[PDB]
Design an enzyme around this catalytic site. Structure first.
Site, mmCIF file in Angstrom:
data_model
loop_
_atom_site.group_PDB
_atom_site.id
_atom_site.type_symbol
_atom_site.label_atom_id
_atom_site.label_comp_id
_atom_site.label_asym_id
_atom_site.label_seq_id
_atom_site.Cartn_x
_atom_site.Cartn_y
_atom_site.Cartn_z
ATOM 1 N N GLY A 1 3.380 5.691 9.948
ATOM 2 C CA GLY A 1 4.742 5.612 9.462
ATOM 3 C C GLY A 1 5.491 4.359 9.870
ATOM 4 N N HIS B 1 0.810 -1.219 0.000
ATOM 5 C CA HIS B 1 0.000 0.000 0.000
ATOM 6 C C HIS B 1 0.850 1.280 0.000
ATOM 7 C CE1 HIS B 1 0.366 -0.138 4.524
ATOM 8 N NE2 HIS B 1 0.466 1.165 4.330
ATOM 9 N N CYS C 1 4.556 1.208 9.228
ATOM 10 C CA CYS C 1 4.417 0.064 8.328
ATOM 11 C C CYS C 1 5.755 -0.321 7.711
ATOM 12 C CB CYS C 1 3.396 0.341 7.227
ATOM 13 S SG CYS C 1 1.757 0.484 7.910
#
Ligand SMILES: *[C@H](O)[C@H](C[C@@H]1CCNC1=O)NC(=O)[C@@H]1[C@@H]2[C@H](CN1C(=O)OC(c1ccc(F)cc1)c1ccc(F)cc1)C2(C)C
Ligand SMILES: *[C@H](O)[C@H](C[C@@H]1CCNC1=O)NC(=O)[C@@H]1[C@@H]2[C@H](CN1C(=O)OC(c1ccc(F)cc1)c1ccc(F)cc1)C2(C)C
Lengths: 306, 306
Positions: B143, B41, B145
């Protein structure tokens, strides 16, 4: 979101850990520039450790008595000296992985990360607080001496602790990196007791603010209290007195949540007098006191280190 | 002695963390050999993340749309491909700090260490269990991920988790390193719920054995129970059923303490029916279920990693 007991990334410290062997004793050393730091009781035997005279013992030692292992690479010792309760072993190679560092001494109530080590090899990492009675509740087995505690500020490692011993209650005692013990302890195998502890009040309040930020709100209330009236309750429950500087330190967390510090004290008062009635706070059924206001702000905001 | 929630030393993973930016999205990547792994993503915008079609989105991207930051050194992307829910960015430089590694998928009930990261920079390390409902109770902000979870066996890093998202209850969901989600979740910003959880029974028993080894004995008793009768109580209190393989896995801890597994089950039964009556076990007022039998043996015996 989430709140979890978090250690600093340990890589910068892992590259400083070495193994120090003298006679029958093996422990860990900390290798910075061309010096290896380690607990002075490595020069001891078992019948030394009961009542040692370390100056005497050290003058009988030789550079070649100290075997320093940096992984599978041996470091030649070219000098040795004692600084209080630590040994400084001067070696012929500067550690190429030496980070920027400082030797700092911390205050009771402050936290740090411990890199537990055996035979010079890191085993695990975890967070500890310095108790008001200058002990720490760690996890240390035989061979773990010389493991260090530290904090990291961007790229600078502030070493604050070297492990030396376990007390009869299972808690742990050690020194700063200049070799000065935290608390009234000596590096002798004799009957030493920790001294009475207290709960770190400002940290409990910080943790309650972490809970609110994460959505645990059930313990909040409309009541308030004065600082003096709160401290009457604190003393009853063996909590530390709260000072105006603690209130100031909690200011930013108060401003973020919109809950006045003295209002959260009223919540703590109620929790102390009533217990939790089968509920939990941040996954705990006890009032947690090993998170500082800075620990809460770092985690509930996300500061990093490069 | 002591028992403390312990993460693996994070150094080997710290050297693999990079920053991946595409458009307005920044997250972490994992750099092994000449590939950077990251959540797919990253190719999304905000109005992409509501209901994205990732094949479509990816064919519209270019190698040069991906900015990979290894500290202050930029890595040129020379290929890209999607594997399930992760992106593989082929770069022109092999990571010289690539450890021996494996991609493994773990089972609910198993633990691992998480290196939380922001902007490619490690922030902290902590231990997590995979819940029976395939979520983890982590600490993750925007932030984070691309942060990974891992275990270490001597010198080999077994990567088991990449972080992707937070559910409405505040728990966290992600994938293995082949991009396959743990549990029935999708990388879309929509209403997904965790599913009902249970308590990991074999881990609670392991933790009770850790307590005995460390001198907490008050919960022991002369009673015993059969495996079937224990499981009738487990089901009542939303605990997992205990199997004979769990009993076998607990064998070594039984042998060390001299407390039969079924005897410790009788202790757990009493703790479930009576509570703790204001006492604690290993500094907890709750029955803890995020330590595996291996975690207890490692810490109460002291295994290292080089
Ligand atoms: C160094 O690796 C070692 C680390 C200890 C071992 C067990 N847990 C630890 O943290 N440090 C020591 O062994 C120091 C060293 C001797 C004694 N000592 C120590 O920790 O205290 C022991 C002790 C024995 C008898 C007493 F009355 C008090 C203390 C001890 C405690 C628990 C245990 F399992 C083993 C030993 C000295 C201080 C020079
Ligand atoms: C990546 O850094 C990010 C990590 C999240 C942010 C907050 N805590 C984390 O662990 N991942 C995401 O932002 C993913 C990404 C979008 C949405 N998303 C996500 O975590 O879920 C959000 C959400 C919003 C609304 C819902 F109905 C469900 C879920 C979310 C939850 C909490 C929060 F603070 C911010 C966002 C997707 C899945 C592609």
């Amino acid at each position: 979101s989430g709140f979890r007991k978090m250690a600093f990334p340990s890589g910068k410290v892992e590259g400083c850990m070495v193994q120090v062997t003298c006679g029958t004793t093996t422990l860990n050393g900390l290798w910075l520039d061309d010096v290896v730091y380690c607990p002075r009781h490595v020069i001891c035997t078992s019948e030394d450790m009961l009542n040692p005279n370390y100056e005497d013992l050290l003058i009988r030692k030789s550079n070649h008595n100290f075997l320093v292992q940096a992984g599978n690479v041996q470091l030649r010792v070219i000098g040795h000296s004692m600084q209080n309760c630590v040994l400084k072993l001067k070696v012929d190679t500067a550690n190429p992985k030496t980070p920027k560092y400082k030797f700092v001494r911390i205050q009771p109530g402050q936290t740090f990360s411990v890199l537990a080590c055996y035979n010079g090899s890191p085993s695990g990492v975890y967070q500890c607080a310095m108790r008001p009675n200058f002990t720490i509740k760690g996890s240390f087995l035989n061979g773990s001496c010389g493991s260090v505690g530290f904090n990291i500020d961007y790229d600078c490692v502030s070493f604050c602790y070297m492990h030396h011993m376990e007390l009869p209650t299972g808690v742990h005692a050690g020194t700063d990196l200049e070799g000065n013990f935290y608390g009234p302890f000596v590096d002798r195998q004799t009957a030493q007791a920790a001294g009475t502890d207290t709960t770190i009040t400002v940290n409990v309040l910080a943790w309650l603010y972490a809970a609110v930020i994460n959505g645990d709100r059930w313990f909040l209330n409309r009541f308030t209290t004065t600082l003096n009236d709160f401290n009457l309750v604190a003393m009853k429950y063996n909590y530390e007195p709260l000072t105006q500087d603690h209130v100031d330190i909690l200011g930013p967390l108060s401003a973020q949540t919109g809950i006045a510090v003295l209002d959260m004290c009223a919540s703590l008062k109620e929790l102390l007098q009533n217990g939790m009635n089968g509920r939990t706070i941040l996954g705990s059924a006890l009032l947690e006191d090993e998170f500082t206001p800075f620990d809460v702000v770092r985690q509930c905001s996300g500061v990093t280190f490069q």
